[PDB]
Amino acid sequence: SGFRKMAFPSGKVEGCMVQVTCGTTTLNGLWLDDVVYCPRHVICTSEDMLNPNYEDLLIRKSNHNFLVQAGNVQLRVIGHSMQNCVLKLKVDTANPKTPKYKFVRIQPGQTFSVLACYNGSPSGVYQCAMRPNFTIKGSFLNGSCGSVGFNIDYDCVSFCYMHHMELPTGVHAGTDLEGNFYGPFVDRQTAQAAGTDTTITVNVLAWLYAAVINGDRWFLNRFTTTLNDFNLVAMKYNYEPLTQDHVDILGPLSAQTGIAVLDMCASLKELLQNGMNGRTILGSALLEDEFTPFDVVRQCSGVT
Amino acid sequence: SGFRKMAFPSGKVEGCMVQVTCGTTTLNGLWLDDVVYCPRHVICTSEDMLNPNYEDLLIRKSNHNFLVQAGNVQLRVIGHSMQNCVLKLKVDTANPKTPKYKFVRIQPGQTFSVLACYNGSPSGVYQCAMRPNFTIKGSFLNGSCGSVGFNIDYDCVSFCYMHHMELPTGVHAGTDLEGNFYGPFVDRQTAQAAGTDTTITVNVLAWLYAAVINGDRWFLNRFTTTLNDFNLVAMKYNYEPLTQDHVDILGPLSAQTGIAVLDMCASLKELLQNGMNGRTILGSALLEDEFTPFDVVRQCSGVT
Ligand SMILES: Cc1ccc(CC(=O)Nc2cnccc2C)cc1
Numbered sequence: 001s002g003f004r005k006m007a008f009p010s011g012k013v014e015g016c017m018v019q020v021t022c023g024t025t026t027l028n029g030l031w032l033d034d035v036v037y038c039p040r041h042v043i044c045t046s047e048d049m050l051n052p053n054y055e056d057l058l059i060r061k062s063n064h065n066f067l068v069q070a071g072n073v074q075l076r077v078i079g080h081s082m083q084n085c086v087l088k089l090k091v092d093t094a095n096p097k098t099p100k101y102k103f104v105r106i107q108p109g110q111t112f113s114v115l116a117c118y119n120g121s122p123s124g125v126y127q128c129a130m131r132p133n134f135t136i137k138g139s140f141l142n143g144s145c146g147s148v149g150f151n152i153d154y155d156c157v158s159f160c161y162m163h164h165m166e167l168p169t170g171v172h173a174g175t176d177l178e179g180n181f182y183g184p185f186v187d188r189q190t191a192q193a194a195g196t197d198t199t200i201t202v203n204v205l206a207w208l209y210a211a212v213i214n215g216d217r218w219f220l221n222r223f224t225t226t227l228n229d230f231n232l233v234a235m236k237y238n239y240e241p242l243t244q245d246h247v248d249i250l251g252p253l254s255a256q257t258g259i260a261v262l263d264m265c266a267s268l269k270e271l272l273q274n275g276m277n278g279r280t281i282l283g284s285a286l287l288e289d290e291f292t293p294f295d296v297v298r299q300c301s302g303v304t
Numbered sequence: 305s306g307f308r309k310m311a312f313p314s315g316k317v318e319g320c321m322v323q324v325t326c327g328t329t330t331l332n333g334l335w336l337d338d339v340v341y342c343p344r345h346v347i348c349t350s351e352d353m354l355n356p357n358y359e360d361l362l363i364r365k366s367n368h369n370f371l372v373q374a375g376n377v378q379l380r381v382i383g384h385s386m387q388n389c390v391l392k393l394k395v396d397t398a399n400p401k402t403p404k405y406k407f408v409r410i411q412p413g414q415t416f417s418v419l420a421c422y423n424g425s426p427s428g429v430y431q432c433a434m435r436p437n438f439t440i441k442g443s444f445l446n447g448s449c450g451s452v453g454f455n456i457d458y459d460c461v462s463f464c465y466m467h468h469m470e471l472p473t474g475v476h477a478g479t480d481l482e483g484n485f486y487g488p489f490v491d492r493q494t495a496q497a498a499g500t501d502t503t504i505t506v507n508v509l510a511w512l513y514a515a516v517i518n519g520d521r522w523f524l525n526r527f528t529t530t531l532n533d534f535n536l537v538a539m540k541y542n543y544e545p546l547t548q549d550h551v552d553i554l555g556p557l558s559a560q561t562g563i564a565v566l567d568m569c570a571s572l573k574e575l576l577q578n579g580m581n582g583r584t585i586l587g588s589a590l591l592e593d594e595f596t597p598f599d600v601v602r603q604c605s606g607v608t
């Protein structure tokens with residue numbers, strides 16, 4: 001028992017981190033097989049950042065300008081190319097520590113672990129969700145660009161995020177591993193609207209099931225609701241509308257606890273309308289939306 | 305910017321995890337150099353657990369009864385001994401992945417990362433604090449025993465905790481790496497009082513400094529207080545009394561923000577007396593005590 005904001009073990013990803021320097025700029029790169037992936041803004045200077053012409057900036061660079069160091073050892077760069085907002089530096093040596101891996105584009109509301117890195121060295125690991133507005137609320141400082149987000153499926157690392165920038169609001173934006181930004185963001189120092197965000201309803205319900213499994217039951221009530229009624233409440237409180245697809249993915253948790261999904265929706269409805277009255281759920285005084293139904297099952301079963 | 309409950313990268317510890325089986329019981333072991341450390345209750349059965357005579361149970365075991373598997377490969381056990389509540393199994397091969405390491409006994413209120421494991425395989429990593437009452441509020445299921453807590457100082461892993469048991473209250477108890485329990489706990493299936501716990505005041509103040517650094521400032525007020533006055537409030541709200549030693553370790557954060565420690569104490573006093581009024585601090589609706597002043601500085605500076 002107990003329920004924590006648990007990240008995947010970061011070892012397989014630590015073995016892929018390298019430092020990439022181009023001119024005066026240094027950030028992190030991800031070395032998988034014989035390619036190093038990093039944010040293309042490694043080729044910019046401060047003057048360039050209002051609206052960089054990445055194509056022109058990259059044309060001024062040669063393979064020898066990209067300095068890649070895997071901890072202590074230097075990698076020899078034999079090719080470079082830009083794909084969307086990432087650079088791919090072909091190196092002459094395949095990373096001996098390359099795990100089995102996939103590049104995936106995650107959906108808003110899904111969760112992943114981030115290995116925050118500086119100068120190619122891992123600093124820490126934390127779990128977070130891709131917000132419905134495609135931002136992440138991470139913990140990143142200057143030099144963290146190129147740090148990645150991922151999930152692990154037994155021996156396979158699915159890389160889903162590469163960190164690119166901090167918005168003026170202090171929230172974070174980045175790309176999938178093909179360099180496509182999540183959300184409307186561009187890699188320019190410009191003020192950029194992140195859409196209206198919402199609370200990930202299916203994750204809050206999954207977390208209420210995790211609470212029941214671990215003995216926090218005070219919020220269970222004698223009520224039920226319908227998807228239509230629940231969605232009027234979700235609307236008022238800026239929660240994502242719940243669909244049958246969300247009810248279906250909560251099926252395992254509903255079966256394990258014997259609490260029908262719509263009955264858990266009625267508990268969530270009352271918590272939204274009444275608040276917590278100074279009480280806590282799994283050590284939190286707010287409704288947590290950073291655990292998916294898969295995360296709750298995985299944590300509550302002991303998946304290695 | 306941003307502030308997360310960040311754990312240390314778990315790679316150096318993942319390389320030390322093994323599975324230990326004795327008879328019908330399986331748990332995790334920590335393989336450092338040519339020794340595997342694991343909880344001594346690996347030698348018990350269900351009948352034995354009300355009050356095991358560990359000395360007698362161990363006498364019935366030989367080196368060949370301890371099956372140790374490092375992922376896929378079997379280790380040859382050439383010695384066994386019990387030290388307090390841990391067993392030390394001497395193996396004929398030094399772990400090639402042994403990091404630089406130390407065994408340390410942490411103080412109540414200090415934090416560490418846990419790598420939860422099952423059957424010698426890492427499941428996830430999370431950050432937590434050793435409660436003032438020497439329990440930890442972890443996330444552990446049956447089979448997680450032998451999972452360890454640690455901190456990392458550049459290249460050195462300081463192991464501070466090995467998981468042994470779950471109390472009937474759902475909180476966790478374990479030992480340092482010499483097998484001494486933290487707190488009054490014994491490795492028996494008996495109901496056991498965990499002392500009265502308190503909130504780690506110095507950590508809450510460190511976290512209020514982290515909030516100011518990241519822009520959450522609403523709780524700052526026009527007041528100041530004294531250690532004596534602040535401690536009357538801490539007393540009433542079950543917080544640890546603040547000492548000059550705690551004020552001194554908050555010195556760096558006070559210098560960075562320009563907010564005198566006693567002025568931050570007056571903000572904490574008002575939050576204790578008035579609550580949050582439905583507001584949040586660093587995404588939390590309660591006062592967080594799982595970040596030490598060192599953790600806040602480390603996270604806010606980017607230590608790898
Ligand atoms: C368009 C663009 C891209 C990158 C940069 C640097 C940047 O944002 N680094 C950063 C990332 N995450 C957290 C804190 C910081 C400072 C500037 C402009």
Ligand SMILES: Cc1ccc(CC(=O)Nc2cnccc2C)cc1
Nearest residue numbers: 001444445446468469470491492493
């Ligand atoms: C004295 C003693 C020691 C160990 C055990 C098993 C045990 O507590 N395992 C466990 C640990 N952490 C979380 C959940 C579980 C079930 C029983 C009795």
